[PDB]
Amino acid sequence: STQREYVFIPITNSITIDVKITIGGSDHITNIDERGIHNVLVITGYAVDEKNGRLVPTLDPCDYVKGILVAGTPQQAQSNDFLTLKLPANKLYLIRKKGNISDDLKIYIPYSSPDARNSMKTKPVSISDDTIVNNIIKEVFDKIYNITQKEKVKIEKVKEDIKELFSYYALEQ
Amino acid sequence: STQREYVFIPITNSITIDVKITIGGSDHITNIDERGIHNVLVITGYAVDEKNGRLVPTLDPCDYVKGILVAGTPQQAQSNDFLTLKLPANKLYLIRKKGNISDDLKIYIPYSSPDARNSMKTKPVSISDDTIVNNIIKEVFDKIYNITQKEKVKIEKVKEDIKELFSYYALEQ
Amino acid sequence: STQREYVFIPITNSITIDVKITIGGSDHITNIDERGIHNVLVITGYAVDEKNGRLVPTLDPCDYVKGILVAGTPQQAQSNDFLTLKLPANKLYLIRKKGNISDDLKIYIPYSSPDARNSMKTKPVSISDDTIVNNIIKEVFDKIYNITQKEKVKIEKVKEDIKELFSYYALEQ
Amino acid sequence: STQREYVFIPITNSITIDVKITIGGSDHITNIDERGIHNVLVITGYAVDEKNGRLVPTLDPCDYVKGILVAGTPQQAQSNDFLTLKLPANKLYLIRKKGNISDDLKIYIPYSSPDARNSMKTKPVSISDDTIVNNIIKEVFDKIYNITQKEKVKIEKVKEDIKELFSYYALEQ
Amino acid sequence: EELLMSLKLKALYPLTGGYNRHSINPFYEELVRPTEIKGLWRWWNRVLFNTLAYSTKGKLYTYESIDRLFEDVFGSENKKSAVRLEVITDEGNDNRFELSYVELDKVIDCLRNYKRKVSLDFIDNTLIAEIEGSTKIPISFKSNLDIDKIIKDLVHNNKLLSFELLGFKSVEIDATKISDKKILKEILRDLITNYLEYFNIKQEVTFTLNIYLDKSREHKQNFEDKLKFALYSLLVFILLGGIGRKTSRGFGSLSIIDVKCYDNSICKKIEDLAKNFLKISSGNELKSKIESILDCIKNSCIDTLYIENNILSEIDPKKNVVYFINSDLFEVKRINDKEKVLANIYKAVSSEGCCIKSIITDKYVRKSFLIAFGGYRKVEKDKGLDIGFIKNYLCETCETVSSFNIVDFLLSEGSFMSDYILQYEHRNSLLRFKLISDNSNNSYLIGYILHSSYFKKIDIKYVRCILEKLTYCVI
C-alpha cells in the first residue's frame, strides 16, 4: 500500500512535473518493457484545465484524461486538492495491462473543485505538436525515469506510442 | 436552468428526505404520471457507501450510482458537501430520454472525500426488500411530485419499476 | 380579408427596412413553436438581383427564393414594385406549415422586370459566414415577432435554423 | 496518354538505360508504390539479341520479353530502332495488372531489324545471382522512379521478383 | 470474344455489401461488386422492357418470362451469358480491415453475472461501450481505414444511415449463467469490427465497367437487336439507378466520366446517348436529356420491338407486381451540398419528417401515400381506425379523395395485394432519388416515381406536384 500519483500527459506547457520528485522506492506500474508505454489510467469525467494541471470533475462518463501514473508524495505543499484514495487494485481502469498488480495503492490525484464559474464545454484533443511531445518527454521521462533520449533508441517508436494512447479532454478555458 | 439536486436512491434510510425548499417552479426532471419513471439521471464513478450516503468519488468506470434529479435545496444553503459544477445539458448521461432539456443546470450532489487507509471495495447491490418503496415513493415522489402519481392509479408501472430503476455499488464498509 | 408582404433573406444590402405598417394586429404568415421559424414561402422562377432587392421573374423552375411574409402594405407609393395576389394559399408552396389557412391572402412581393440589355444566368448561393447570421437576426428578426432576446431560449439555435432552411438564388451580375 | 516507351530487362546492360527524358507530365505505368511491382508488359514473338539488343522479331509464340514500360521520349528522337506504335491499351498484355490504363498509348519499344543469314535459334535466359539484379535495380528502377525507394521497405522486395518476374528469350548467336 | 464497350463511371457514397454486409472485411475490400451490376442491369432491363410494353401494347409481362426472352443475352439455366462484366475499380489494392488492438477489459468486468446489452457510439473520434445499465465506458482501439471525420458526421447526421446502424452496433450479453473472458473478449472484439467496418464509406468511388461480347452467339431471333436494347437498359440503369444499398435514397448514385466503345455497329447510338452526359450544364437541360434518352427507346428509333413472340406471358394484376417507367414523373433540380440532400431525403420519406408533413398535410393521406410509394412501411394494425382510414385511401374502389387505389385492394377482407402492400418486409420504393454529375461540378438531384402494376390508376399531375414540392424542400 505505497503512494502513487497521476502525472497525466497533456498537450499543455503547465507541466514542471506538476506534483513532486521521483519515488524514493523502486516500484513502477507504468513500465516501458514491451514496446512503449504500458499500464495507463484513463479515468473518466475530468479535464486538465489547460493551466495549473489539476482535474476538474464532470458528470459526463464521456470526458477522459490519460497519462502516466507514478509513485511519490503530493508535493507536501497542497493537501487540500488531492484525493488520497486507496484502490484495491481491482476497481481501477487500466490500458495496456501487464503482469497483474494485486496489491492496493494509495494514489494521489490533482483535483481542483468544479467551481461552476462557467459552463463546462469540455472539448477533446489528442497528443500532438511534435515540438511539445519532446517537451513533456524531457521534463518527465528524462526526469522521472531517465530512461528515454539517452539509453533507449527505440524512442523513435515510443515517440508515436505517446501519440497513440494519450488523448484527453479539456475545457479550452 | 439553475440549481438542481441529484437525489441518488439506495434502499437505505439515510438521506431520504434530506432536502429543504425547492425552486418553487415545476421544472423537474422525473415526472411519472402514467408512463414509467422517465429522464432518470444516473451518474458513473461513485458509490452509495451503504451508510450516510456521501457518494465517494470512485475511479472505477464499472462503478456507478443511480438516482433521480430535482431542483431542491443545497442542504439548507450549504456547499461544503457538494461539487457546484455546471452542465451543458448534452454531457449529462440521462436515462430514458424525453427530449426537452434546458441549456445549463447547476446540478448539486452530496459529495465526500476519500477515506484514507481503506480500500474502497465497491460492491454491487440492487434494490430489494421493497418495504422501501412506500417509504420513498410517499416521501421522495409523493412529497416531491404530488401533483401526478396521486391523481393517477397507473403507479403499478412505478411499483414494478422501483427495484427496476436504481442499481448501485457500495464500498460496503 | 388579410394583407401580407414579402421579406426573403439574402446577404445583400437591400433589406434595410423599406416597409410600411406592421400586421395591424399581431398575426404573421408564420409562427414560432419549435426552435426555429415555420411557414416559409417559396416562389419558383425568381432571383434577387443582389442590388435594389426586388425579385425579377425568371422562367426556370430551378430558381430559389424563400422567406417569411410580413403583414401590411408597402407604403402604397411603390404601388408597382409588388404583385398583390389574392389566393386562398392552397396554391402556395409553404414549408413547415403549422396552420390551416382557409381565408384569402393579399401578398405583396418586391417585383421587377429584366429590361434585359444582356443575358441573365442566375447563380445559387446560400447563407454562411456567421458574422452574417447574427447580422440578419437583428435587422430582420427582432422586428417580426417582437419576442427576440428578451425571454427566448431559441434565437441562438434559430441561427442554425436560418442557415440550413433559407436558400436563395442570385443573378450575381 | 502521349508518347511512352517499353524497355526490356537484359542481364547484359550494354543498353542499360540509353533512353531519354520522362513524360514531361506525371504519369507512369509501372510502379513499386507499397506492395510490389505493378503493371509489367509482356510482348510475344521477340528475342532480344542481347548485343545492342533491340527486340529482334520472330514468329514463335513461345518467345516473350517482359519488362517495365515508362513514358519516356524515344531516346532524344532516335529515328532508327523503335516501332512508334499507338494502341487503345486493350492490346497490351500486363503481368501483375494494377489499375486502369489510358485510352491510347504511343509506345516506342526498342525494335532492331530481323537479320538475315542467321537462323534465330533463341534460348531462354532467366534472372539469378542477385549481384545481377542490383546491377539493374538502381539503373532502371531507382533512377526513373528516383523519388521513393529510399523511404519504404521496398528494396529487397524489388530484388525478390526481379529474379523471376522478368524472364525472356535471347538470340544467343 | 472481344471487348464491346467500356464505361468509366463513379459512385457517390456507395454502400456495397459483402458476406458481412459491409464493403470491407478482414480479408478483402470491394466497393463495387460486379455481381450487383449484372443483377441490377437485369432488374433495369425487366423494367425498361415493361415500359416499352406499356407504351406500345398496353401489356405487362412477368419477370420470369422477360429474362426468358433475354436469356440469349444475359444467360439463364439453359445458356451462358453472352455479355460478361469486368469491373476494375481504381487503386487496385488489397486493403483488408485489420483491427490492431482493442484495449477493452473493464467493460468485460462490467458485464459479469448480468444480462445487459453493449452498444457502440462514436463520440468525437472515440467510441464508447454504452452499457444501457448506465456505463458509457470508453475504448482505446487502433485499426485501419482512417475514418476521417466526415463519415462520422455523415452517418450521425443522416437519419437513414443511423437507423440501419441499429443492427450493427448493439448486442445483448447473457452472463447470469457461466461466463468467461476469453469468450467475452471475442464477442466484444467482433462487435467492434462489425461496427467500424460500417464506416468504410467513401464518396467518389471511380471504377471502370468493361463489357465483353463473345462473337459466338448466332443471331437467333433478335440477338443484334436484343443486345442493343440491353445496352439501353444499362444506360437508364446508370442514369436512374445506383449500385449498392439504399439506392432508392440517393446512395451509390452512378455518374459517367467517359464512355468508349469498340464495335460501332452496335454501340453507335448508345455511346452517343451516353456521350450527352459528360458536360451537363443546366437542371432542366438534363430533364430534357432524361426524356431524350427515354423516348429514343420508345416510339422514336423503335429497337425492333418484337413482342409478337411466344416467350412472353401477360401478368395477373391481382397476383403479380411489375415496375416500369412512367416517363412523366421526373424532376431535375440542382444542388451543391451532396451530403446535405443525402441527409435531407429523410425529411421526404418519413411519416413525420418536415417535407411531407407540409405537402400531404394530414395523417392518413400522408401515411397511405408512403404505404403505396415509400416501399414497405412498418404499419402496426393494432390501434384504432388508422388501419381502415388508411385503407379507405388504398381500396380498389371506394370513396376516394386522392387516387391511391390498388388493383384488388378490397376492404372487409384481404386479397393478395392487401397483404403484400401491407405485410411483406421486402418491397422496393417507387419514390426514388439519385444525384448525378461529372466534369461540371454541377450536381443535379433526380427524383422520379416508378410506375407499378398494382395501381388501379394514379392521378398523374397531383402526385407529380407532390413529387415536385418534394424535390424542392429536399434541398
Automatic annotation (TrEMBL), chains A, B, C, D:
One of its GO terms (biological process) is CRISPR-cas system. It comes from the Archaea. InterPro entries: Cmr7A, CRISPR_Cmr7_comp. This is CRISPR-associated protein Cmrx. The lineage of its organism: Archaea, Thermoproteota, Thermoprotei, Sulfolobales, Sulfolobaceae.
